[PDB]
Design a protein around this ligand. Structure first.
Ligand code: HEM
Ligand code: HEM
Ligand code: HEM
Ligand code: HEM
Lengths: 141, 146, 141, 146
């Protein structure tokens, strides 16, 4: 449950991401595919090589959904409704993998926001990715 | 893995009582019912829309039998599951794209199934021994993922 | 989310459990300590030998809390509020261990309720134990 | 664990630049902030009530340095993490009663801290190599639990 401080922390951090959001989403995916190779089983139809347009493109979609979640942080279930339907009924990604991408996103933000990534901000971001993860897996069963 | 001889003899003894085909069908179908996202690999199989449809689907029963027969044959090589399951590991990664978390989910449903089948004979110590076996199998099947 | 059909399934199964709830609670604990020895790190002050009064006593407490949550399945947050504060602020059990006790309670039920443990009820009970686990971990951060 | 020589050299190179005392205090502090239930083990340590109190707590810094020091020593025996950490494994089980899930959390926080500290130098491949190492170390420390 996101406290007002957590919300402030997340809007601030994601704010400084701004326009690089897409580039950071791709890097987070690349980090995930190299560190946790089991995650590649959901992308047999992609070229996962370094610099792949497919990964970059997917990264930009992931990032834009997170941008949408930050804008609607008081009403995430409705904002992300179609994406929870999508993952629940079509993609059917095992819920364990959400934690793996969330860690990779945190790593990416850490690597790019040397000053904003304070202990308190780290805590709020991890809570926020967990809440996104919970919504996206809400309709699985 | 590493089972004590007492543990090995407990696994072996109960398994001698198992109808591999029936338990296979039951465990695969309950996998698909309790954790419906596992249905993702099986849409070639027809009607999976309700519990009854899943449990009664002949393709599901056939797959279950094939998965549990390999499992059964692995119980003879508890000293070397990784070698026993190395080619199946490769296959499930490179060609079937099965996230190895499904092996763990299956192993926990298998345990529930044995418990339901054997009732009070499935004691805490016997459960513990089967937990080790099912984690060992899952590990062995995940070992060649890359 | 528990569907109404899930609630009917949990009520019916736990109804059967009836008066054995505490004996079943202790058996699930003993299953957990033997199958998942890391969980014993939270009970270094207990005699964990088979049949100890401390384990039986704790089994009954676990079982009554579950009984309270089945009674108030539509309002579990309010119903378990005291227990979520206790686990979040005092006991501080890592969340991963809730999954292990849930598995062992499901195993215990399966072993004792041969007629009622159908696929659909198994599904409903797993989902119920996941929701209890989520409410008890709610206030951790 | 098994590292390719280019993972081994990635891990080795970065680690020669790490101030163990400073990174250790940061990693431990962040664990206690981001996952506050881990404070369970440290109530002898003082004031842990706000992020600034945890990060500036001197007992957190001191212990942080002790833990990453032992962690350092294991990078020197990457081929036999189990034998290097057997004694400490037994201590954290029998005397300290620490759930080994905490080893995993600190591994991931340490990766966060390395990324924060080294920026773009902590590339995806370097991360991958460090993830194998911290999983290895966690595993090594959990090996003697019973
Ligand atoms: C923060 C969590 C995540 C977010 C916000 C997210 C968001 C999205 C979005 C926006 C799409 C595109 C939907 C469309 O086509 O309209 C998508 C697709 C997809 N996602 Fe997720 N997702 C997340 C986690 C994951 C994880 C953890 C996995 C697997 C490890 C995964 C696997 C996929 C796959 C396989 C697709 C389809 C890709 C394609 O075929 O083009 N997702 N995701
Ligand atoms: C005890 C665990 C497992 C064992 C021993 C096992 C074993 C096998 C075997 C022996 C085959 C046939 C290989 C061949 O064609 O040569 C197979 C195929 C397959 N398995 Fe696994 N499996 C296990 C778990 C799983 C799980 C949990 C799933 C997914 C939910 C899965 C999905 C598949 C798929 C989709 C195929 C292809 C079936 C076909 O093409 O007809 N397996 N497995
Ligand atoms: C289904 C989820 C669980 C339920 C409903 C539950 C319920 C309870 C209840 C009713 C108490 C007694 C509180 C009192 O005296 O007022 C308690 C205490 C406790 N629980 Fe939880 N529990 C759950 C999961 C866990 C897990 C997973 C662990 C650790 C592996 C755990 C460890 C403890 C410990 C250490 C105590 C203190 C016992 C003592 O000092 O006597 N609990 N729990
Ligand atoms: C990277 C993995 C870790 C290593 C290498 C490590 C190593 C050590 C060492 C060197 C000591 C001193 C033992 C002695 O004086 O004989 C120690 C103590 C201790 N560690 Fe671990 N540790 C690790 C992770 C953890 C984690 C994550 C926790 C819990 C959150 C933890 C909790 C403790 C506690 C409670 C002590 C006792 C401190 C005191 O005496 O008050 N450690 N550890």
């Amino acid at each position: 449950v996101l406290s007002p401080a957590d919300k402030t922390n997340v809007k601030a951090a994601w704010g400084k991401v701004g326009a690089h959001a897409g580039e950071y989403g791709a890097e987070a995916l690349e980090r995930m595919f190299l560190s946790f190779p089991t995650t590649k089983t959901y992308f047999p139809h992609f070229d996962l090589s370094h610099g792949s347009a497919q990964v970059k493109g997917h990264g930009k979609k992931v990032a834009d959904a997170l941008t949408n979640a930050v804008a609607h942080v008081d009403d995430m279930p409705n904002a992300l409704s179609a994406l929870s339907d999508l993952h629940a009924h079509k993609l059917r990604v095992d819920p364990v993998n959400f934690k793996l991408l969330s860690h990779c996103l945190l790593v990416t933000l850490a690597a790019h926001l040397p000053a904003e990534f304070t202990p308190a901000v780290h805590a709020s971001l991890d809570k926020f990715l967990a809440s996104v993860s919970t919504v996206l897996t809400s309709k699985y069963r | 893995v590493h089972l004590t001889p007492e543990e090995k003899s407990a696994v072996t003894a109960l398994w001698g009582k198992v109808n591999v085909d029936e338990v296979g069908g039951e465990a695969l179908g309950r996998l698909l019912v309790v954790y419906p996202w596992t249905q993702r690999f099986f849409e070639s199989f027809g009607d999976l829309s309700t519990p009854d449809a899943v449990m009664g689907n002949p393709k599901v029963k056939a797959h279950g039998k094939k998965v549990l027969g390999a499992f059964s044959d692995g119980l003879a090589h508890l000293d070397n599951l990784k070698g026993t399951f190395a080619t199946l590991s490769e296959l499930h990664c490179d060609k079937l794209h099965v996230d190895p978390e499904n092996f763990r989910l299956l192993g926990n449903v298998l345990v529930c199934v044995l418990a339901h089948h054997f009732g009070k004979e499935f004691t805490p110590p016997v459960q513990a021994a089967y937990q080790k076996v099912v984690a060992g199998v899952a590990n062995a099947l995940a070992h060649k993922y890359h």
